[PDB]
Each structure stands twice: as structure tokens, then as C-alpha cells.
Design a protein around this ligand. Structure first.
Ligand SMILES: [Ca+2]
Ligand SMILES: [Ca+2]
Lengths: 48, 62, 524, 348
DNA sequence: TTGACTCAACATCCAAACACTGCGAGATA
DNA sequence: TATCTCGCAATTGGATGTTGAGTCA
């Protein structure tokens, strides 16, 4: 809500992760963004 | 003469003290774009501080 | 905050032409403002160039031999030989300036070349960090020999000044073009930079006391020295190049903080082409530009100015009639026969002063007249509107139609006389027209012993004082339906009643009281 | 107000006035005219005479009339004989009219077919339930003795200028904004209107106001929701009635014209129609006690009982004691309003 | 590469004086 | 029948210049 009872989206829900290693950060970032891309593909499939 | 000065001082629309509204009436009618806060003459004329101008103060302004 | 710091990393896949009049005026104003700012920049930079701390350093760059070449002995028999030695020194200075600078930087964004209106519109859209350049930074850059071509030439002028030669900084001011009325003002990207930098914005002029002429020097961009007669290597040529370099305000700054408009030297067609693209094309812009120059011209006139003015006058004499019809539209000196207004005549005894070959038609030719030989005529009514009546036995010079038609006669200024209205009487009574008003379209039309008081309440006042006046018809309001209306903007009273009226319209204690005293001695 | 909302195109219906010169004897289609132009002493220009000549020339097959009772039937009969028409129509408003002479305008036109049965019309949904109320605001002892010393008009200047009226007005103004209802106040006095319209911050439509500023408020009232309290004199009610604002406040009332105020208040309630379930159209009157205006305002409410509208009395609503924004509540502001009214009585 | 056409949609210039209060509608104690 | 109010009466333009786009020789 918006402090009264009318719905809003002031911010989007997100997760805060902290990384310490660089190779693993590169790998997790590339994997996650690739999953995001495949997900766009699957949602494109589903919205039809 | 006193009669002439009172006549000059009695050229308004009351005959009681020259009020701010009376000075305003005169200044507005003779053409004067004067702000309500442009008392100046009348404002400074007030010797005893009662917010108006009596005969003696009018005489002293003249 | 958290999204501001921690950047979203994602893979979002994804497979006519004339603006409004408001924009016209906004472009004219922005053009002026921008020009002024540029001219002030040139003034200040010229100050910096005069820096003593810098000149003592740059002086050491010029060998004695070269100094002597820059200040040759006056040669009586043939002053040209001295000019020669001067030019050789300037050339050698140009050569060693290449040695001095070494690093030249590119312009970050179009430098001071002309920007498009679209670019100016979108520049406000996105802010950008700007590395400030203080006077000290400028001096350090010039001494180290690091910077864009503008800073380079500026340093060069500073060097010449260090060697006590009379060297001007020349700036071709490139404000946005207020004549370009297009909405979309896109430019060709092909060779954009190379075409932009094909001609310079800053260069140098050096006074040659032997031949008495300014010598043009661009030691950085075109790397030449020329003695401009009719053609200059520095004026941009080609549609591509003139999209970012429109030559219209070439400004000269000298050792002594002078400021002179020097476009005439570099513009072949000042009076026909360039004038169209300058704010000076009309009387207001003329005065405005003269005001700016004067504001930037911090010295007395010299004999050199006299020489340069003679040069400009000869360049004006020899520009002559333009080659094309368009360039004679609104020309300051000439008019085509076909452009003489229906309300104009050729002054007696005058004829054409030249012809125009019309491009596109074999042997087709137009008659060109000097504007000094065209006389403007007005009708009797129009002259009265200018406070003039016709002389006795004046004959009209032209007859022209109007609307329901009507044959109106036109007269020249010489056939007209200044209208003098009758004086006010002793009591101050004015003589008025059939409507009970006095018509006052020109100062002349006020009676000699009278004055005009313009005020929304001047009538109420004069009526209130019961004094003698006349309402003043100062113009005519044209309004809806079909009907003209007189504009009674005030009162004509005798002169000795002015302050009475002004009190009446205007109204200290004494003034207010005295006006009351009068109002009463008057009513009864 | 309607004929363009209606199918009528005024391109043919030239309006003739003898001042509003219009196209006569050339109108391709129907015309709209008026009794004053058609036949009256107000034949200022011969445009009316030419319109009548054209009316004689063309056998006008039908005639539309609106409120002929006011105009004497003599001109009606004169133009009936002059034009020699085919048919006419009477859109009457009253059962009994002054034009019921020996030659009845009925048989001059035709028989009766329908009667404006207001009990059938004024109850099915248009007025949205009139709620006639009169706020009985108190008066003061300084203005009462100065009220009795004044007579012959210069005495209404002490009646309208009351410090508790500003406490009842700013309370009903803030009360209607909490319910989401627009307010359309009415008055009679000219000066006393600008003094109550400038201090509350409520644009105004009054006498001799330019129309460029008059239509701008109507664009800020029909579109913008920030202007829910407008102040109209007698021009903005006899020209255009607003179908919005289900809360009406009467402040300045004139004697005699209490039926003319009833015709003005009735045209607002008839314009407000949309058939809502609640649709409570509140009417208030800030009447001060023991003044000569509230006893004439009872004649105005007596006309509303004749129309069938219900009238109730509200002495004070339990909520005005909790509003700190009521001007002239403090006795200092009541003495400052007393000096401003004493200067107004010295000017009038 | 040049400029003189034409087209169309605005923009811009320029002409240039009647008065002002009476008088009937409705309504009015 | 005397008294106010108050409305009512008395659709700038047309000629000429500027601008950019486009077409032609
Ligand atoms: Ca007084
Ligand atoms: Ca005093």
C-alpha cells in the first residue's frame, strides 16, 4: 500500500548479496544473468 | 488666521483628528498611488503617537 | 541509494520543417546572449595573453636574429623590403612555435565551433563534469606547450606580444544561427570533426607599419601567413564546413585592450551574404552590437584604426553588386527595380547603378539601383500622421490605388512642411478638432506653449481642476467587427499648468493640503 | 444552454433583438425570436420591424413560445393577426396567467394536452432532495444599538457585516470540503461581497467583471478540484447554472426579491440532476438573530413550502466550536471588524 | 554545385473617430 | 399605485514578406 490503502510499487523487492571472491563473483554473475535471459525466453513462451 | 488654518485643517469629512483613512481618502482623490504603508507625511506628523494627526500637529506640519 | 551505488547488472534482450515564432524569438535572444558571452571570453583571454609572468618566459623562445627580423630598420627607398623581413620573422616564429608546443589536444565537444539548436536543447538535458581552467592553468599550459589548437594560437599571440610586436588575437565567434528556423537541425556525421577543424576559430593579426596593413597569421591550423586583399584562406568554404563555422563575427583584440569588428577583412560578401546572418541586419541589432563593442573597447582611437577603416571602406567599395537575386533582397545599399515599393520613386535625374545577369535565363538582366537614389513618398494623410502638411502648390509625384477603388496621391518629403498648431490662449484654452480632441501624432503637433501629459487619469484630473485642456488622440486602436477607435492616451494643457495637473494626477502633507486649498478656491 | 446540446444549429435561428442585428428575411431555416423584439415598445431599431415584415411574408407554419404570461397578450394577438400563421405552441408555466382575456390564447393556439405536474416531476429524481436549512448565527450588542439608529437602506450595512457570520461561513466551508462536495455561494450586496470573497481566497464573479476572468474560474471549477467554493453575484446565476455542487450557501439576501431568490435557487436544483441514491442537495442561510433580513427570509422559505420542498431549522451544528480557523472569533478581531464596518457606514 | 523558380503555411506591416446614456420589461410597499 | 433594478440599445484583415522543401536547368 501507499500508507493509506491505495496500492503502489515504490520500490521492487530485491535481494542483497555480498561477494568476497572475484572468480566466483564473475561466475555467479554470469550464471545469474544467463538464467535471467533464459527466463525471459520462457516467460515469452508463456505469455502467448 | 486661525479660521483659515482650521478651514485648511477642516477640509475633510469628519470634523472630530485626521485619521489614516481620511488622509488616504485625500491622497487617493488628488491622484496619489500611495501604498497603505505610504503614510510617511501623516505617519511622521504624529507627535503624541496616537496614530492620528490633531490640529496642533497639522499646524506644525505646515 | 543502494541502486545508485550497486549498479544493476542485467541482460535485457531486445531483438514542413519550420518551428514556431516563439522558438524564433527564443533563438534570437539566445543567439544574442551567447554572442555576448563569447565576445567577453575573447576579451578576458586577451587579458590573460597580456600576462607579464608569461611573456617574460616566452620572450626567451625568440632568438635575437628573429627579434631583429620582427623589428626591421625602416627602409626609406623601398618600405616593401622591410615588410619582407617582417614576414620572414613571423614565418620563423611560426616554425619555432611548432617546436614549442608538441602536444596538441583534440576539442572535447565541438570546441567553440557553432552548435546546433538541437544540441543546445539537449545539452541542458544531461549535466557533465567540467574541468575548470583558471588563469594559472592557462599560463601553465601555454608554457608547457600542451593543449588544443585554440590555446596554442593564444600562446603564440602571447609570444609575439612578449617580443613587443603589435599582435591581435582574432576570434571568429560562432553563436548558434538565429536564421536557422528548422526544428530538426541534424548534421552529417561523415568526416564531422575533420570538416569542423578545416578552418580555425582563433588566429592572429600583426600590424605592418611599413605597408600599413594588418597581416593575417594562422600558425597552428592552416599554418600560413597572408596579406588579405580580397580573398582570405581562413574564411570557411563548402556547405559541410559552414555548418559548424559560419563566419559573421570576426573580432580583433589588441595589446591595448581594444575591440574591433574585423569581419570585413575575412568576409568577401559582408554586405550581401554575411549581413543576413548577423544580428546587425536591422537597426536594433546594429545599436545593440555597437553597445557591446563599445563596452569591450577599452582604448582611444588610433591612426591605425584610421588606416584599417580606409581598408574596410575600399573593401566595401569593391564588393560591388552581388551576383545573385537572393543576395539583393534587403541589401543595405542596392535594390532591384522590381523591389521598389509601390510607394517609392526614383529620385529625379538618377538611374540604375548596375545590372544583374539572372542565373537561369539567357540574356535575362535586372536593373539594380542604389538605395540612396530611391525616395519614399507618402500621402497627405500619412504625412499628417507624421505631423506634416503639404506646401502651397505642391504637385504629387505618384498616384496609387487603394480599396473601396480610390486614387491616392503621394508626395515627397520636400513637398511637405512642418505642421505648427495654433497656440493656447492666455487662460490656457486649446483649439481642438471637430470631435473636441487634439490630434497629437508627433511632438511637433503639441502647441509651443503647451505640454502633453500622458496618463490614464490625466483627463479625470484636468476635469477635476476645472482647468482648460484638450484630450489628446495619440494613435488609433484597430479592433474587431469593422471599426477603428481613437486612443485618447491623455491631455494637452498649457505649460504653466503642468505641475498643477501632475499634482492632480500625482496626489507630501503640504502638497496634499495645497491641492485641497486650490480645489476649494476653484469649485466655489 | 440547450439548442446546441439540442440538434438545433443556430446558423439559421437568427436571434433578433433590435440590437442584436441578425439575418432576417434571409434565414434558410427556422428562427428564434423574442416577444420584446417581435412586438413591444422596445423597438429600438427597425431590425424588429423588418423581422415582422418577413414574418408576414412567409406563412410561418408553427410558432414556439416560452413564458408568454409575462408579456401581455395584446402584442400576441397583434402579431397573430399580422403574421397569419398556420399553427402555434404555448409552453406555459402557470395555471392562471394575466393573458387569460376574453380571447384566450388557448383557442388562439390550441387546447391543453399536458400539465406540468410538479408533484410527478419534482419527486422522481432531479432536485435530489432539497434540504432547506437556515443557520441561526448569533448577533452582538455593539451592532444592535447601531442597527436601530440606522434606517432607509444604510441600515443593512450593519446587518450583513457580522462577526459570527464569518464563523458560520468558514465552518460550513470547511465542513463541505470534508464530504467532497463543492459549494456555490450566493449574495445580493456588491461591496459586502468582495470583502467576504477576498479574505476567504475564493475567486469571484460579480458585477462588471471581464469575461476573460469569468470563464477562467469556470475552467477552474468544472475541471480543477481546488476551487470547490465559488462566489457569484447575480450575473453567474441568471446566465449559466451549474449541475454540480450539492451544497448551497446563501449569505446576502435582499428584501422583496425573496421570490426572485426562489427562482434563482430553483434553477440550480433543477440543473443538478443525475439521479443519485443519496444526492443530498443542502441549502443553508446564514441569518443573524433579531435582524430585518431573517424575517424576510422566512417569506422565501414559505415559497419553498408551496413548491413542496421540506424546510428544517438548524440553530448551530456541533462542530463550529472546534474550528480554530474561524475569523473574527476573537474579541479583538470583532472590534477590528466593528471599526471596518463603521468606516463602511461612513462611506455609504 | 549554382541559383531561380514555385508552393504553402504563417508572420508581419498598415491602415486611421460618433456619440451616451434613455426606456420599457418585472415587480412593490 | 410608487420604486427600484436592470437589460437593451448602440464569426482586424488584405496585401506583402519570410521561411524550408522541392523541382528544374
Ligand atoms: Ca477624522
Ligand atoms: Ca497625534
Amino acid at each position: 500500500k501507499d500508507n493509506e490503502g491505495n496500492e503502489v510499487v515504490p520500490k521492487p523487492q530485491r535481494h542483497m548479496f555480498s561477494f568476497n571472491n572475484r572468480t566466483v563473483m564473475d561466475n555467479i554473475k554470469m550464471t545469474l544473468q544467463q538464467i535471467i535471459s533464459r527466463y525471459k525466453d520462457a516467460d515469452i513462451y508463456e505469455e502467448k | 488666521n486661525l479660521t483659515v488654518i482650521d478651514d485648511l485643517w477642516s477640509m475633510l469629512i469628519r470634523n472630530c483628528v485626521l485619521s489614516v483613512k481620511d488622509l488616504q481618502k485625500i491622497s487617493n482623490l488628488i491622484g496619489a498611488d500611495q501604498s497603505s504603508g505610504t503614510i510617511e507625511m501623516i505617519s511622521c506628523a504624529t507627535d503624541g503617537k496616537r496614530l492620528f494627526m490633531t490640529y496642533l500637529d497639522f499646524g506644525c506640519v505646515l | 541509494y543502494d541502486s545508485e551505488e550497486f549498479e544493476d547488472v542485467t541482460d535485457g534482450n531486445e531483438v514542413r520543417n519550420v518551428c514556431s515564432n516563439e522558438e524564433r524569438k527564443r533563438r534570437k535572444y539566445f543567439h544574442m546572449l551567447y554572442l555576448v558571452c563569447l565576445m567577453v571570453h575573447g576579451f578576458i583571454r586577451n587579458e590573460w595573453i597580456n600576462s607579464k609572468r608569461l611573456s617574460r618566459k616566452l620572450s626567451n623562445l625568440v632568438p635575437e636574429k628573429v627579434f631583429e627580423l620582427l623589428h626591421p630598420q625602416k627602409d626609406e627607398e623601398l618600405p616593401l623590403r622591410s615588410t619582407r623581413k617582417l614576414l620572414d620573422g613571423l614565418k620563423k616564429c611560426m616554425e619555432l612555435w611548432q617546436k614549442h608546443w608538441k602536444i596538441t589536444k583534440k576539442y572535447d565537444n565541438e570546441g567553440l565551433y557553432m552548435r546546433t539548436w538541437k544540441e543546445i536543447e539537449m545539452s541542458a538535458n544531461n549535466k557533465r563534469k567540467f574541468k575548470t581552467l583558471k588563469r594559472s592553468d592557462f599560463l601553465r599550459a601555454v608554457s608547457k606547450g600542451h593543449g588544443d589548437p585554440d590555446i596554442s594560437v593564444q600562446g603564440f599571440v602571447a609570444m609575439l606580444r612578449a617580443c613587443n610586436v603589435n599582435a591581435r588575437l582574432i576570434m571568429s565567434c560562432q553563436p548558434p544561427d538565429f536564421t536557422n528556423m528548422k526544428i530538426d537541425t541534424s548534421l552529417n556525421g561523415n568526416n564531422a570533426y575533420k570538416d569542423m577543424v578545416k578552418y580555425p576559430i582563433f588566429w592572429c593579426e600583426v600590424w605592418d607599419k611599413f605597408s600599413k596593413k594588418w597581416i593575417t597569421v594562422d600558425p597552428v591550423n592552416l599554418k600560413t601567413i597572408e596579406q588579405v586583399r580580397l580573398h582570405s584562406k581562413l574564411a570557411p568554404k563548402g556547405v559541410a564546413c559552414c555548418e559548424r563555422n559560419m563566419l559573421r563575427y570576426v573580432i580583433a583584440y589588441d595589446r591595448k585592450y581594444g575591440c574591433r569588428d574585423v569581419t570585413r577583412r575575412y568576409a568577401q560578401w559582408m554586405n550581401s551574404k554575411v549581413r543576413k546572418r548577423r544580428i546587425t541586419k536591422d537597426d536594433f541589432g546594429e545599436k545593440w552590437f555597437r553597445k557591446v563593442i563599445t563596452a569591450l573597447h577599452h582604448r582611444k582611437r588610433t591612426k591605425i584604426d584610421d588606416y584599417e577603416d580606409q581598408y574596410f571602406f575600399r573593401r566595401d567599395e569593391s564588393e560591388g553588386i552581388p551576383d545573385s537575386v537572393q543576395d539583393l533582397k534587403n541589401h543595405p545599399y542596392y535594390v532591384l527595380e522590381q523591389d521598389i515599393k509601390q510607394t517609392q520613386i526614383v529620385k529625379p535625374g538618377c538611374k540604375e547603378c548596375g545590372y544583374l545577369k539572372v542565373h537561369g535565363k539567357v540574356g535575362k538582366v535586372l536593373k539594380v539601383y542604389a538605395k540612396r537614389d530611391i525616395a519614399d513618398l507618402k500621402s497627405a494623410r500619412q504625412w499628417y500622421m507624421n505631423g506634416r502638411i503639404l506646401k502651397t502648390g505642391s504637385r504629387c509625384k505618384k498616384v496609387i490605388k487603394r480599396t473601396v477603388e480610390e486614387d491616392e496621391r503621394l508626395y515627397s518629403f520636400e513637398d511637405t512642411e512642418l505642421y505648427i498648431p495654433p497656440l493656447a490662449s492666455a487662460s490656457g484654452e486649446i483649439t481642438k478638432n471637430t470631435f473636441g480632441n487634439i490630434e497629437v501624432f508627433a511632438p511637433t503637433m503639441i502647441p509651443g506653449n503647451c505640454c502633453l501629459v500622458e496618463n490614464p487619469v490625466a483627463i479625470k484630473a484636468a476635469r477635476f481642476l476645472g482647468v482648460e485642456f484638450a484630450p489628446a488622440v495619440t494613435s488609433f486602436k484597430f479592433e474587431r467587427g469593422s471599426t477603428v477607435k481613437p486612443v485618447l492616451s491623455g491631455i494637452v494643457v498649457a505649460k504653466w499648468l503642468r505641475e498643477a495637473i501632475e499634482t492632480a494626477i500625482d496626489g507630501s502633507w503640504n502638497t496634499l493640503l495645497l491641492k485641497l486649498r486650490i480645489r476649494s478656491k476653484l469649485n466655489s | 444552454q440547450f439548442l446546441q446540446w439540442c440538434t438545433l444549429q443556430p446558423e439559421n435561428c437568427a436571434v433578433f433583438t433590435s440590437d442584436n442585428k441578425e439575418m432576417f428575411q434571409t434565414e434558410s431555416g427556422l428562427v428564434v425570436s423574442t416577444y420584446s423584439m417581435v412586438a413591444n415598445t422596445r423597438n429600438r431599431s427597425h431590425d424588429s420591424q423588418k423581422v415582422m415584415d418577413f414574418l408576414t411574408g412567409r406563412e410561418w407554419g408553427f410558432i414556439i413560445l416560452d413564458e408568454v404570461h409575462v408579456v401581455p397578450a395584446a402584442m400576441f394577438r397583434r402579431v397573430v393577426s399580422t403574421i397569419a400563421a398556420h399553427a402555434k405552441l404555448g409552453l406555459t408555466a402557470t395555471l392562471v396567467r394575466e393573458d387569460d382575456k376574453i380571447g384566450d390564447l388557448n383557442f388562439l393556439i390550441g387546447p391543453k394536452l399536458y400539465e406540468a405536474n410538479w408533484m410527478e416531476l419534482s419527486q422522481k429524481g432531479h432536485i435530489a432532495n432539497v434540504q432547506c436549512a437556515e443557520v441561526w448565527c448569533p448577533m452582538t450588542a455593539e451592532f444592535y444599538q447601531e442597527y436601530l439608529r440606522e434606517t432607509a437602506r444604510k441600515r443593512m450595512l450593519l446587518y450583513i457585516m457580522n462577526p459570527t457570520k464569518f464563523q458560520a461561513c468558514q465552518f460550513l466551508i470547511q465542513y463541505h470540503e470534508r464530504r467532497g462536495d463543492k459549494i456555490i455561494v450566493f449574495s445580493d450586496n456588491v461591496y459586502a461581497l468582495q470583502e467576504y470573497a477576498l479574505k476567504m481566497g475564493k475567486p469571484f464573479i460579480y458585477g462588471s467583471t471581464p469575461q476573460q476572468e469569468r470563464m477562467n474560474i469556470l475552467q477552474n471549477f468544472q475541471y480543477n478540484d481546488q476551487i470547490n467554493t465559488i462566489f457569484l453575484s447575480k450575473v453567474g446565476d441568471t446566465s449559466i447554472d451549474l449541475p454540480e455542487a450539492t451544497c448551497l450557501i446563501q449569505i446576502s439576501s435582499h428584501y422583496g426579491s425573496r421570490r426572485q431568490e426562489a427562482q434563482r435557487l430553483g434553477r440550480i436544483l433543477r440543473a443538478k440532476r443525475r439521479n443519485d441514491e443519496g444526492f443530498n442537495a443542502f441549502f443553508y442561510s446564514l441569518v443573524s438573530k433579531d435582524t430585518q433580513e431573517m424575517y424576510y427570509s422566512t417569506k422565501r422559505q414559505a415559497f419553498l413550502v408551496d413548491q413542496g420542498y421540506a424546510f428544517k431549522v438548524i440553530t448551530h451544528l456541533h462542530g463550529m466550536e472546534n474550528i480554530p480557523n474561524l475569523a473574527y472569533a476573537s474579541p479583538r478581531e470583532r472590534r477590528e471588524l466593528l471599526q471596518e464596518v463603521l468606516l463602511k457606514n461612513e462611506e455609504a
